[PDB]
């Protein structure tokens, strides 16, 4: 449970008496604890928003250099200037006029033509890929709150061999999933992928190991050279003048110089955008949203035919309060009497032991039959003073507690 009960964004959704549907909102880095009447407590959390098979739409260049700068000029009324490289699309040229005359190698004064080209090479580029609901896939983790060892589970590693933890996946074309939770029944998951986000107005952008989600219109209006899609060898760049400028032209020459790298200029424009991961051809997200419906009628308690744990418990840690007011208590059970139902409650009247508040780990059950087993619990106490009562009989455990 630990990663769920230590998270800051933890919503508490409650079921019904015998209800079968509850609504949940699943955001990244957050957990939803779903409690129900006479049902085990299950944790829901969205762990992986990932996109794949994105269509490359347009690639912009943000750093470049030139080569093979050649020029050609002709006298006034001697016709337009021409270079062999003027037709090459890998070269960028610029027509211009410059004063010529008798001391400049011509027979009549006036302005004559002049063209200067340069081979266009792009140091680094960025790519904008398109995203469609045919690319989304959400991964939700379904864990059981209180299986006597979830108090030592902190992450997803090892969830395959753990029957109390199930992993499901959701796509917009397949928004449903079902999985078994071991001896705690099974869980249903009907999710709305439309309420996730608006992924028809955005592009997935990659630039030098950094990746964002950017608006479609902001991406079109970027003033940089660009091609459509991608191509092997050398593709055709459009609007090469965004990085190449032509400076003051002498009577037979023109200085070609490139602008500085525009990487930092793009970073400053991507301050408010969402940052994303890159895993090969797949894209990974850490900022999303998910409204889902939980089918909990198939959830069940682990064995209720068990007997109450008759041996004596001992505190292993000192009870600590969580960020949500709940108390975590870790206990050690010295009994060897098989699996047994853990007697745990909160009683404001120590003589009648009438329950106040509730347990977050509903119906805790020691499943080990060896001495000195450990189990961590969680309790939602009432405000003010109340007694944590764990166990039965003489050696029962009492720890005073106050909640604001």
């Amino acid at each position: 449970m630990i990663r769920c009960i230590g998270v800051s964004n933890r919503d508490f959704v409650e079921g019904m008496s015998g209800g079968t549907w509850v609504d949940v909102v699943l955001e990244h880095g957050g957990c939803v604890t779903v409690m129900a009447q006479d049902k085990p407590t299950v944790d829901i959390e969205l762990v992986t928003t990932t996109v794949s098979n994105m269509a490359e739409v347009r690639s912009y260049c943000y750093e470049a250099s030139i080569s093979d700068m050649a020029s050609d000029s002709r006298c006034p009324t001697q016709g337009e200037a021409y270079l062999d490289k003027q037709s090459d699309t890998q070269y960028v040229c610029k027509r211009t006029l410059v004063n010529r005359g008798w001391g400049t190698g011509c027979l009549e004064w006036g302005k004559g033509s002049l063209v200067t080209c340069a081979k266009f090479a792009c140091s680094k580029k960025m790519t904008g890929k398109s995203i469609q609901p045919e690319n989304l896939e959400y991964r939700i983790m379904l864990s059981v709150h209180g299986s006597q060892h979830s108090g030592m589970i902190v992450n997803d590693t090892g969830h395959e061999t753990d029957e109390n933890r199930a992993k499901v996946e959701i796509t917009p074309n397949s928004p449903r999933a079902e999985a078994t939770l071991g001896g705690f029944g099974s869980l249903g998951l009907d999710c709305e992928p439309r309420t996730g986000l608006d992924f028809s107005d955005l592009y997935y952008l990659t630039m030098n190991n950094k990746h964002w989600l950017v608006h479609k219109e902001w991406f079109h209006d970027i003033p940089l050279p660009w091609h459509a899609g991608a191509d092997t060898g050398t593709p055709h760049w459009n609007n090469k003048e965004a990085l190449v400028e032509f400076k003051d032209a002498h009577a037979k020459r023109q200085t070609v110089v490139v602008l500085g790298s525009q990487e930092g200029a793009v970073h400053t424009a991507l301050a408010g955008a969402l940052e994303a991961e890159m895993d090969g051809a797949k894209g990974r997200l850490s900022s999303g949203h998910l409204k889902c419906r939980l089918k909990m009628d198939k959830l069940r308690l682990k064995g209720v035919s068990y007997s109450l744990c008759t041996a004596a418990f001992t505190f292993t840690k000192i009870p600590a309060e969580t960020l949500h007011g709940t108390v975590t208590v870790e206990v050690q059970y010295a009994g060897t009497d098989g699996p047994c139902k853990v007697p745990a409650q909160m009683a404001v009247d120590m003589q009648t032991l009438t329950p106040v508040g509730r347990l977050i780990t509903a119906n805790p059950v020691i499943t080990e039959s060896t001495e000195n087993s450990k189990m961590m619990l969680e309790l939602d106490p009432p405000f003010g003073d109340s007694y944590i009562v764990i166990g039965v009989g003489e050696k029962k455990i009492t720890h005073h507690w106050h909640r604001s």
Partner: antibody, heavy 127, light 108 residues
């Protein structure tokens, strides 16, 4: 246009070493994790090694643990596999394979699958 | 005999539905993504099915990938004489921390 060219494999004696190479082109090599898969003549496929995009994570098959070593130079877009202390059973046609992911997450290894394969390089151990 | 086991040899008449299946454990096929590969005789392996239900662009709809329980099955509806090859399944094993292949299945 994607292509992988394996090279560096001939006939070698047991106990000695060998270094293979896989030339990558047509994709950002530094962005994708890469694998080695060998196949003995007339046998099944056997996965050998994997290296992530930044070369930080490496996993080997139990048969070659500690004896092989996968490595990569993202600058020149090449893949190296250092096989030393060989045996007669290591004779196989070795393929390098591109993985759809760069292995930059906990969920990369499960989602992993080998995207593009090379052509092979017949390594033979005779004695 | 191997981390994943598929039949060594299956044969179907041309123009008929044939299926091939490999089974593993809860650590390889149960949770992780199963992929298939077609190795035509004397050729390099060829990615056939990824994400356990999806066809790469170019593979005809004669092929189909499924996954139920801890065992994924390959599908070939309307076999043709150009499909005779060896077929391998494989995925990542989480308990072994080692990528594993299937035994292979020469189709006839």
């Amino acid at each position: 246009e994607v292509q992988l060219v394996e090279s560096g494999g001939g006939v070698v004696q047991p106990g000695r070493s060998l270094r293979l190479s896989c030339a990558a082109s047509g994709f950002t090599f530094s962005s994708y994790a890469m694998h080695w898969v060998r196949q003995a003549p007339g046998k099944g496929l056997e996965w050998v090694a994997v290296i992530s995009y930044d070369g930080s994570n490496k996993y080997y098959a139990d048969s070659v643990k500690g004896r092989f070593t996968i490595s990569r130079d993202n600058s020149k877009s090449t893949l190296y596999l250092q096989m030393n202390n060989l045996r007669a059973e290591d004779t196989a046609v070795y393929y390098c394979a591109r993985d759809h992911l760069g292995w930059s997450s906990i969920w990369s290894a499960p989602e992993s699958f080998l995207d593009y394969w090379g052509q092979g390089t017949l390594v033979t151990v005779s004695s | 005999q191997s981390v994943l086991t598929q039949p060594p040899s299956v044969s179907a008449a041309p123009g008929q539905k044939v299926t091939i299946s490999c089974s593993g454990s809860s650590s390889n096929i149960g949770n992780n993504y199963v992929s298939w590969y077609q190795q035509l005789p004397g050729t390099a392996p060829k990615l056939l099915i990824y994400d356990s239900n999806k066809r790469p662009s170019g593979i005809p709809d004669r092929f189909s990938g499924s996954k139920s329980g801890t065992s994924a099955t390959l599908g070939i509806t309307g076999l043709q004489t150009g499909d005779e090859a060896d077929y391998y399944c494989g995925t990542w094993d989480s308990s072994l921390s080692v990528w594993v292949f299937g035994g292979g299945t020469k189709l006839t």
